[PDB]
Design a protein around this ligand. Structure first.
Ligand SMILES: [Ca+2]
Ligand SMILES: [Ca+2]
Ligand SMILES: [Ca+2]
Ligand SMILES: [Ca+2]
Ligand SMILES: [Ca+2]
Ligand SMILES: [Ca+2]
Ligand SMILES: [Ca+2]
Ligand SMILES: [Ca+2]
Ligand SMILES: [Ca+2]
Ligand SMILES: [Ca+2]
Ligand SMILES: [Ca+2]
Ligand SMILES: [Ca+2]
Ligand SMILES: [Ca+2]
Ligand SMILES: [Ca+2]
Ligand SMILES: [Ca+2]
Ligand SMILES: [Ca+2]
Ligand SMILES: [Zn+2]
Ligand SMILES: [Zn+2]
Ligand SMILES: [Zn+2]
Ligand SMILES: [Zn+2]
Lengths: 100, 313, 326, 100, 313, 326, 100, 100
């Protein structure tokens, strides 16, 4: 549910960047891979994150596993929006995302 | 006004559908075929009906929905058209644009077939209903039309964008004609003042197909809760200082530029067309001519209001 | 030759589906959407696969298959195209036109996307396989192509009709181009001589969709068993006489003309019935693009009208301001 | 299974001719009503009956009833084709249909 | 001015060539291929040269030539271009646009190949010559250019029309751009004041083809002698009364309408397309937009000159 | 098989014509315009007929003909198309593609206009004739078509190359579609089995033009006599030895590389030589139409700019007229 | 050379109108066939005649005959222009053509 | 008719190499100049000589002389092909060309 360890995962970014990025790095600063996560999970290209983008980031297949319940995802995204977002715009900005 | 995007009443690509096969926070019924990038509410087969509604009811006083859709047909006549609804109950299947009749709420109909035979189609019709008057399907709801419009949304080169805003008990529908890929290019279509709708209800879309056949794809559906600047209570001492944001955003943009530069040499390191580019250039030139004429109109209105003040002197 | 229409391996409208929603004597899998009139094997969404196969195997030595189908696309490039199979096992799911690879039989592929980049598509490719040869998907089966005629079957004003005949171990494909409403207007496409196919197998159709997207409708599928005139036993003893034929045929024709006259005065008697032309249904891609440009010019026209009117208003305002001072 | 009484039913043909032709008749000859049946069930307009048209005729839905199984349909149509069609063309002509 | 069409220095379709195979009152040399409807002065083969000149010399003081032509090329670069000459002697073959150098007269060159490399081609160049200075072929006659222009006349959807008028020792070249089928739609290109040309000379056209290849067809060539209203002497008591003309012309128009009606039922009695009609409609809409903007410019000029007189009051 | 290039029935550039202006070993009639590089058999004028035939008759039993040609039109409809004849007598003028009817031989017609109205044109039609069968001009020879593949050869970016081979009484037509600059990229079109043609006859080409107009260029014509490996006598006694071959081949290669190195430093030494790309030469009809529309919009752009500056000028005039009274 | 009898010729108008006009008339007034001649020989559709149109009208192949010399045609057209045309516009109008 | 002295002519090859290569040499070996002749007269770039290229070589126009008749050209080229070309391929290779 968008935890500190979930964002700080080398295997996840290495799997996501496979194909698009032909540059496997050894070790990166936590801010660097969190920036990679934020840039990768913004599909619309508006430099912003919302509930749908967060839901896609959390509940995705990868390469079996049971699907998470809709109520749990709703609660997790509601908590994330209530905690990180302070401007009440609905979108999650990297300025707001830098707290966690 | 101040807008807040509500994710629980929205869907968009390119990951619209999940591995389960259902739209998150949305229930679809009928012949709707949700996909990874769009929802085909009604395909181009004979006698098709589909609808996608919200699961949880939305409780807003001022809201705004931005709907992007394509209505594509082989012929020059549409089958039924699209319908966007802010209702009280999930209609699902029904006889009105693939949704149930006798709805308690508001409905915007993108009618593309002239049942009345008045040669006034395709047209956008806003109908409010308390749940006691049947929709006149054979007359395109002419008697129940609170406000009408006259636009063509079929076979456009670009997806057609509409914006429906309920603000201060006034419903405004502003529709892009689909001739440009720009998102914020809405043109005024219709408005209804002092219309009563239920305080809480379901957001839904629906489509149907009659004797002819059209494909009604919906690419996105974004809902924004609207609040007044004075009505929204501020929350002091909760936000972070602007110095930290300024320090962070410059390094964020520098790192994203560096990432783009890194992608530049690796996109071609490991392995549109003619005619399509020409058509895009033609449409861009038409849009530029339209924008220049709009600028001329604004300049001439400027000189008109300048000469207006010179009369009294 | 002598033809016998076999109903168990055929489907056609306008009552193609039953109340259950399935095609009789046919099993459909994937993203196939059967309707009352046609079967949409693969709709116009991205990454769609569909197939409709026969339940019971067909045991024929000489057969004929008539396929009526449509492939419609918004653009000028098709997604994958259709595939008509006479196989040994129902390959309902797979990556070869929505059907499984390594089939034991014959397959006619209506390829509409040029993977090989030879600018030779859309084309019709006949491929025979014994069940151990992979299909070259990235090259449209150029090496495995027994016979390949080049034809366009996309966005035609009329449904495209194809006829595949297996007779004396010779497979003949004759394709109506879909430009005329006439049925018996077939034009030769290809033939393959001395091809060995399994004695019994399943008849099927399939379609898929790649990057681009097309609508792959199949309106009808007719199967005819073919027999040589000398091999088929006549057995004229089962027929009664030609007298009953002569006594029934003229009364049948009389009933037809009487029913036509009966319907003539009531076709126009009730004005509720209305027709619809089909000429406006068809429109080419370039014609649609030019019509879109012509429609887009109307905004410029209306804005220029508004500008001219507002200039005329400011001209009148300047005219009425002249005499105020003097 | 296409019995003598099945074709000789005024209600079904009266329901079928409703809408297309607005001539409700009181009583018709057996040959006339069998001619109406043969002409109305021929959807393709070839003045012939085959397995698909007979399957539509048998498995019929008016205005509930369970649908007939595939095996019963196949057996009934095969028996009808074997009994009536003598020219082995696969189609049933009116001369072949008038025997039963 | 008053115009008189001179047939001896003109050719047009649809019967341009005779049974003999030669243009009447015109001599053609080089690779010119006259046909029934047009004269191909230079085909699209490599190193082609052609010219069509008048046989008898024309003695005019003020004249006007209307030339309709098409310069069509597969590529985006023209080969040499066309040339229209009012000279003193028949050049026929030569090294300047398929015509002889050192001419005594005026020549209008529709240069389509940039030999100078200044990216200023295709262009229309008017060159006067007394017969003693060689034409600078490698520089597109930049030094000898009395007046230049900048138009594109290649691969236009409609034939390109040019009008060259020598009036009161002033040569005016006004060229239609070929975007409309209207004949009287000339736009100003160039003018030269106080230019001396021989009193009598030959009218000719010519074309050449270099490394690339263009087809230079000429559909018509019409010559009008121009005279001033005051200089032309009237001839009283020679013309017929206007009453007879009025009586005749009404019956002429009635009979031609009756003849058209007669052809109407017999054209179909005894036995364009989609896309081409759409392109024609697109071009018509573009022309309508251009005309409406021109009318807007005229209205703005009118209000400007109206407000000019209000200053002094 | 074994191929021998026969020069007397061939022509190619860049020195196709002589100083006299005629093609060596070839006689041209009609509206054919031979040039230094190509022969324009029928130009883009209305009602043009042209033909180029051989002078001496060719006595071959198995032959191969390679024809490089271009058919260019402003519109999307061709006029008549080309015709390649192997006949018995030179029909210099006539109504069948610019050549006389009732020929005794074989003719490959590259028909580009659909007289029959079947929307199956342009198409390549092989027609054999014994000298007493009229060609169905109003139906594109549909009844007489021995083998007809459907292919487009108009407005191609590269010249269209065709190869017609007569070998063991089997006529094979293999057509390069003209999409790649490579020469040996032929794609199969058609074959006719067991066709009887005259033992000796004239090789010729011809073209015509009807309502519309096309440019029918022929760049090259190459004729090869084909002999079976067993029938051709080897006769190795005339050859001297392989030692002279080994002594000459490497010195030829050394001279080639030395000349390449010699030309390398002087290709860039003199800057007078300049090149020209061929990509911009090719442009499709729809692309040209869209470019014409985009070019036509520039007049509207410039007029709007002029109107804008005039409105700004009258605004400045009003601004300076504001302060005069007070 | 544009004589009264040359214009008043039934066979010439009947031959020219063949194909385009499927209405063979028996007898017509001389003004009627002279109007037919004037309407037929105006190719440009401007309701006017000039020297080129007159040359096409006089010197055409029809359905052998030697071609007329250019000098004779020039003299004939010059005489016609000098006689019939009075407005000195160069074009021959039906108002001017009605004299002959 | 392609004699030993005909190929061994410095003036013709010097005129041919003028413009294309700006290297005017004084004296060259007979094999070198015959190599220059063979390489320059091969227009198609196949390193082969055939009847058309030999016809261009024989009927040549430098900077008058009457053109050779067709029969003489045909006889000369047929004799050259019969004498030099031994593999009966129709083409003349450098090995076949070096004999004469
Ligand atoms: Ca975002
Ligand atoms: Ca935020
Ligand atoms: Ca309606
Ligand atoms: Ca209506
Ligand atoms: Ca493919
Ligand atoms: Ca391919
Ligand atoms: Ca039937
Ligand atoms: Ca039967
Ligand atoms: Ca130049
Ligand atoms: Ca220049
Ligand atoms: Ca034809
Ligand atoms: Ca045809
Ligand atoms: Ca006229
Ligand atoms: Ca006059
Ligand atoms: Ca060679
Ligand atoms: Ca050799
Ligand atoms: Zn992941
Ligand atoms: Zn019933
Ligand atoms: Zn005549
Ligand atoms: Zn030389």
């Amino acid at each position: 549910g968008l935890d500190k360890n979930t964002v700080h995962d080398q295997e996840h970014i290495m799997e996501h960047l496979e194909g698009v990025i032909n540059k496997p790095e050894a070790e990166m600063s936590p801010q660097e891979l969190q920036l990679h996560y934020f840039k990768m999970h913004d599909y619309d290209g508006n430099n912003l994150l919302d509930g749908l983008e967060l839901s896609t980031a959390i509940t995705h297949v990868h390469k079996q596993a049971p699907l998470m319940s809709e109520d749990e995802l709703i609660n997790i995204i509601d908590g994330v929006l209530r905690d990180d977002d302070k401007n009440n715009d609905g979108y999650i900005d990297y300025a707001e995302f830098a707290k966690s | 006004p101040h807008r807040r995007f509500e994710y629980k009443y929205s869907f968009k690509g390119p990951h619209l559908v999940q591995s389960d096969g259902t739209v998150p926070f949305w229930a679809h019924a009928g012949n709707a075929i949700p996909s990874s990038d769009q929802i085909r509410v009604a395909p181009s087969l004979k006698s098709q009906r589909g609808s996608v509604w919200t699961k949880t009811k939305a409780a807003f006083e001022n809201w705004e929905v931005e709907v992007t859709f394509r209505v594509t047909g082989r012929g020059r006549i549409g089958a039924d058209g699209l319908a966007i609804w802010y209702a009280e109950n999930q209609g699902l299947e029904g006889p009105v644009f693939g949704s149930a009749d006798l709805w308690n709420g508001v409905g915007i109909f993108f009618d593309s077939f002239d049942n009345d035979g008045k040669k006034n189609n395709p047209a956008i019709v806003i109908i409010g209903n308390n749940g006691q008057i049947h929709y006149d399907h054979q007359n395109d709801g002419a008697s129940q039309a609170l406000a009408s419009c006259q636009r063509d949304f079929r076979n456009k080169p670009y997806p057609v964008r509409a914006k429906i805003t309920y603000y201060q008990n006034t419903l405004t529908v502003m529709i892009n004609n689909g001739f440009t890929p720009d998102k914020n290019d809405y043109e005024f279509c219709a408005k209804v003042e002092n219309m009563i709708i239920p305080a809480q209800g379901h957001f839904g879309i629906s489509a149907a197909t009659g004797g002819l056949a059209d494909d009604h794809d919906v690419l996105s559906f974004l809902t924004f809760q609207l609040t007044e600047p004075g009505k929204e209570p501020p929350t002091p001492d909760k936000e972070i200082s602007e110095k930290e944001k300024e320090k962070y955003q410059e390094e964020f943009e520098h790192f994203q530029q560096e990432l783009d530069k890194k992608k530049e040499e690796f996109q071609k390191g490991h392995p549109e067309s003619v005619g399509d580019r020409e058509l895009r250039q033609v449409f861009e030139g038409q849009n530029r001519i339209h924008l220049e004429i709009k600028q001329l109109n604004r300049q001439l209105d400027m000189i008109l209001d300048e000469q207006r003040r010179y009369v009294s002197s």
